Design a protein around this nucleic acid. Structure first.
Ligand SMILES: Nc1ncnc2c1ncn2[C@@H]1O[C@H](COP(=O)(O)OP(=O)(O)NP(=O)(O)O)[C@@H](O)[C@H]1O
Ligand SMILES: [Fe+3]
Ligand SMILES: [Fe+3]
Length: 903
DNA sequence: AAAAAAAAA
């Protein structure tokens, strides 16, 4: 039967007309073909064609054929009658009441139609091809189950008249795509990636502009020659679509380490070792783990290793995952610089990928006229970022690929053609570490090479990550009998893993010498007791005792406190003590409005960092901060005083001590004899005690084992970096360090709880997804999280006078905008930037279950993604001008300008 | 009680 064009696929926004189903199908088949040839990394075409075990050209046409079948489930009465249509020639298949989505219909029909073209009835390949297409709206379905000998009828396809039109369609795209014979094999992981491809295909050719265009040259009839014409036309008009969305490859020339970084006169020890021993190792899919200290050129090292592995695997794309949004911003700058120099592309975006990327003026858009590597409007969309040829963003963006959520197969497809580089792997907690492990496991099976950068890494984590990657590569998991692939890490050191054979190659094995790093003075670590008042720390004396030389002779110091309260206490006291005259005083923590925090930080690195010392602005000064100091802040301090924290974190903090001493530029005061970290700890009165406020942030046992490990050294300095990795390993490894068996077990139990939540959250192991994709998107009883915990909400403080009316400043000069200064009273981007710039992150708690109507944003705000979820915090200001502490959620708040938000 | 991330076709 020749095919009827009366059956549509699109109607919306089409100004009264309808695009035919066949035309969408051919379009979507065309896009997939082009995507295969012009978007896919060559390595990825290879990986896929191997799973099907056929040549690439065939694999392509198969894929294109499949793509053209994605919306066939639309050829039902349930879908068709959503608008006016003349179905009089089509009696039967009366409405069932099921209300069954069209993609669900595809996956229900395809298993019993495919065999008429060659597919093995009840085959694994047929099963997967139906399931995968059935999942082209981001949700896979179960394999169809039936009890009769007539599944088609059993599933609602009872009318000969309807069944004819669906086979017409089936043959129309089969023919139009060159009638590809069925592949022999197809596995789950490969199928899920292809699902991604099919989804990108649908999306590209569903753009209103592209549609209105094809709508000017519909086919006259349903003849083979006409549909052949339609397909070939859409074939031509798709590469244009790629460029308009900036999906074109960024390819980078092979290059030695120096040719890639010509501005570098004296390549690092780490860089020399990597560049020398790695090209011979990088013969295909592998994982590299570099673990080295801060300030050793890890970034350039990474790009190079990434460039090798990219070439070895025909994968030109890149994802760099960073721990924070800010570091992602910075790295996005470096990589883009690297791009410009390294390539000899106005249709390829270097995407920036995190939740605040839209409100970045320098990144977001306000064709062919474009800046190179610039964001396109298309990639700025939801779910599309990883489809950018190159991208840097938060690690959370990659981790979202292995969560059981809609459209994850899209993100999986995005990564599958790239080299993924995750930086600061030491920063990933036990919940994130299970997600990382599932990603590595899935990346391993998909042939994607990985570079893991870290600072020191506990050997067990190191072991888990490479074990995870090897599992994916090798098809099978780890035995109980099987030996561990990584039993030791060296800091500094690197490590190569071959995916094909599973050979681990330590840097030790290829060179007996240790990797030369910046030499530096060992770190003096000094445990000092503090009197406890009211289960708190009376740091008063000591602060005076230890800071005394700095008031006379000058210098730079930092005090690090476990909580924001304790951080605010210390500042206040420093101020009281300082009213008695030079030196300066600063306070940094997370509870400041953005604009303020981005300002405080800038001046603080301005004084204590490298471009400060170089420019002479470095003072003759004290900083008080919380764990924000553990983030990348360019600081060099002459003395550091810290509350006890876990050693990994202490040692992390202590890397701010004399950070740039090898620069030779800085003059240290006569009292700063050696680089020193002072570690405060409560005096006791037989397993160590710590403040409740401390034990709520860090598990008690960890603080105990850390104190015990440090006491044991009797004053002895920490040689750097020879002593570090052993400390890091030992705090967890040495059981004699924990004398509170009860506190220690709890610690272990809390860790279990976090890995457990994680396992609920993630998609199956690749081998569990072999013949069944349904578990990738299965969930019941909300949104799954990339990080553990109750999280944070963004608050905004508004001001109320006696009158009383709503203001944005204590001075009551800036009216609280009920509306937005855009046409229609709507908010703009640049509007949302001004509001968000004064928002404060606040940690979720009981206070949120006690909010009221005046804690919620006005009606106009709900229309805005960025403002809808804000919490409003009132602040009462007296008619004298003083700001009062104000109750919200069952407690009192006050946004002090020097001390940040207080509650 | 830290810090950190987080509308499709
Ligand atoms: N020989 C060199 N090798 C690598 N980087 C160098 C070299 N000489 C100067 N640099 C620069 O040193 C700067 C900072 O060094 P770097 O090792 O990156 O420390 P960092 O940025 O504080 N920590 P990280 O970014 O994680 O590596 C970068 O801008 C480099 O370009
Ligand atoms: Fe669809
Ligand atoms: Fe579609």
């Amino acid at each position: 039967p020749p095919l009827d064009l009366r059956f549509w696929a699109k109607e919306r926004g089409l100004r009264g007309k309808t695009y035919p189903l066949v035309c969408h199908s051919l379009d979507a088949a065309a896009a997939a073909l082009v995507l295969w040839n012009e978007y896919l990394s060559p390595g990825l075409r290879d990986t896929i064609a191997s799973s099907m075990e056929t040549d690439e050209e065939h694999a392509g046409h198969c894929i294109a054929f499949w793509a053209g079948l994605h919306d066939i489930g639309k050829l039902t009465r349930e879908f068709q009658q959503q608008i006016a249509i003349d179905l009089s020639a089509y009696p039967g298949e009366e409405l069932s009441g099921e209300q069954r989505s069209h993609a669900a219909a595809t996956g229900k029909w395809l298993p019993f139609a495919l065999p008429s073209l060659g597919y093995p009835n009840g085959g694994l390949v047929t099963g997967l091809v139906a399931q995968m297409l059935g999942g082209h709206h981001g949700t896979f379905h179960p394999h169809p189950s039936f009890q009769s000998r007539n599944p088609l009828a059993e599933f609602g396809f009872s009318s000969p008249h309807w069944e004819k039109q669906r086979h017409a369609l089936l043959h129309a795209v089969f023919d139009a795509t060159g009638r590809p014979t069925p592949p022999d094999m197809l596995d789950g992981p490969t199928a899920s990636v292809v699902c991604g491809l099919v989804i990108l295909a649908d999306w590209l050719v569903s753009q209103e502009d592209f549609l209105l265009e094809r709508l000017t040259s519909l086919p006259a009839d349903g003849s083979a020659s006409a549909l052949r014409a339609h397909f070939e036309t859409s074939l031509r008009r798709i590469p244009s679509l790629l460029d308009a969305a900036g999906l074109r490859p960024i390819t980078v020339p092979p290059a030695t380490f120096t040719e890639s970084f010509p501005h570098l006169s004296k390549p690092n020890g780490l860089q020399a070792s990597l560049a020398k021993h790695l090209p011979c190792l990088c013969t295909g899919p592998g994982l590299v783990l570099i673990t080295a200290p801060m300030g050793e050129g890890k970034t350039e090292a990474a790009y190079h290793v990434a460039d090798l592995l990219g070439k070895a695997t025909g994968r030109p794309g890149r994802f760099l995952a960073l721990p924070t949004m800010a570091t992602a911003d910075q790295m996005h700058t470096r990589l883009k610089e690297y791009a410009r120099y390294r390539v000899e592309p106005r249709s390829s975006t270097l995407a920036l990928l995190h939740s605040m990327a839209w409100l970045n003026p320098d990144y977001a858009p306000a064709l062919g006229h474009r800046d190179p590597f610039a964001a396109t409007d298309w990639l700025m969309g939801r779910k599309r970022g990883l489809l950018a040829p190159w991208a840097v963003g938060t690690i959370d963006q990659a981790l979202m690929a292995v969560l059981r959520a809609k459209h994850n197969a899209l993100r999986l497809f995005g990564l599958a053609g790239k080299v993924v580089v995750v930086d600061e792997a030491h920063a990933v907690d036990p919940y994130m570490q299970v997600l990382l492990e599932q990603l590595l496991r899935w990346l391993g099976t998909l042939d994607v090479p990985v570079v893991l950068l870290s600072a020191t890494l506990h050997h067990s984590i190191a072991n888990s990550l490479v074990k995870a990657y090897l599992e994916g590569a090798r098809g099978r998991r780890w035995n109980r009998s099987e030996p561990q692939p990584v039993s030791e890490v060296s800091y500094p050191g690197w490590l190569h893993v071959d995916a094909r054979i599973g050979k681990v190659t330590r840097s030790s094995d290829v060179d007996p010498l240790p990797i030369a790093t910046t030499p530096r003075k060992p770190l003096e670590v000094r445990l000092v007791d503090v009197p406890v008042k009211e289960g708190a720390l009376n740091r008063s004396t000591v602060l005076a005792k230890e800071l005394t030389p700095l008031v006379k002779q000058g210098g730079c110091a930092a005090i690090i406190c476990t909580t924001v309260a304790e951080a605010q206490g210390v500042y206040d006291l420093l101020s009281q003590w300082f009213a008695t005259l030079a030196p300066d005083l600063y306070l940094l923590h997370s509870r400041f409005p953005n604009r303020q925090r981005t300002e405080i930080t800038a001046t603080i690195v301005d004084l204590f960092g490298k471009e400060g010392a170089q420019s002479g602005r470095r003072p003759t000064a004290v900083l008080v901060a919380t764990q924000v100091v553990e983030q990348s802040l360019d600081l060099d301090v002459d003395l550091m005083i810290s509350d006890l924290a876990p050693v990994s974190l202490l040692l992390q903090r202590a890397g701010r001590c004399w950070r740039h001493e090898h620069l030779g530029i800085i003059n240290r005061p006569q009292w700063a004899k050696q680089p020193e970290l002072v570690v405060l700890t409560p005096e006791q009165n037989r397993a160590p005690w710590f403040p409740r406020s401390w034990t709520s942030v860090y598990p008690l046992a960890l603080l105990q084992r850390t104190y015990t490990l440090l006491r044991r050294r009797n004053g002895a300095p920490v040689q750097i970096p020879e002593d570090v990795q052993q400390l890091v390993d030992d705090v967890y490894d040495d059981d004699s360090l924990a004398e509170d068996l009860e506190a220690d077990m709890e610690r272990m139990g809390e860790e279990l709880a976090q890995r457990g939540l994680a396992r609920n959250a993630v998609i199956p192991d690749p081998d569990d997804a072999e013949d069944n994709l349904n578990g990738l998107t299965e969930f019941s009883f909300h949104v799954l999280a990339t990080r553990f915990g109750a999280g944070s909400v963004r608050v905004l403080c508004y001001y109320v006078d006696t009158a009383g009316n709503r203001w944005l400043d204590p001075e009551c000069t800036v009216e609280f905008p009920e509306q937005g200064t855009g046409r229609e009273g709507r908010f703009t981007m640049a509007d949302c930037r001004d509001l968000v710039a004064r928002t404060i992150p606040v940690r979720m708690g009981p206070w949120a279950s006690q909010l009221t109507e005046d804690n919620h944003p006005p009606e106009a705000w709900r229309e805005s993604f960025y403002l809808r979820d804000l919490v409003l915090i009132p602040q009462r200001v007296t008619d004298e001008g003083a700001v009062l502490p104000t109750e919200t959620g069952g407690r009192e708040w006050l946004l002090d300008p020097c001390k940040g938000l207080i509650f």
